């Protein structure tokens, strides 16, 4: 995941000009937790894997 404010493709001459540039949705979450679990801290069941849509 790469974040940039310039609307230039990663393979373009203006960009680094290497690799394939793909649109990324949302922010990257470190593998271990998924966020909302328990009102009082108990923790829910998180999700893992890369590319997996769940």
């Amino acid at each position: 995941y790469r974040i940039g404010s310039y609307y230039i493709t990663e393979e373009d001459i203006n960009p680094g000009d290497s690799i394939s540039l793909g649109f990324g949705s949302w922010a990257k979450v470190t593998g271990v937790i998924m966020g909302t679990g328990v009102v009082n801290p108990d923790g829910s069941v998180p999700n893992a894997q890369r590319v997996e849509f769940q």
Binding site: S25, G35, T36, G37, V38, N40, S44
Partner: protein, 52 residues
């Protein structure tokens, strides 16, 4: 009263009522008792709120 006809006298002290009499009553119930608030089955229930 048995509606008995007197031999010589007349029972003028007995009569049949026609309508009821409305009177003022005293106080009654004060208020309701305790009631439950919130759901016990939902207490400590895990809720998922993680964003995408």
């Amino acid at each position: 009263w048995y509606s008995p006809g007197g031999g010589y006298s007349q029972r003028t002290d007995n009569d049949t009522h026609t309508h009821t009499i409305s009177g003022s009553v005293s106080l009654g119930r004060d208020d309701i008792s305790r009631q439950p608030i919130n759901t016990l089955p939902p207490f400590r229930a895990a809720h998922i709120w993680r964003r995408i």
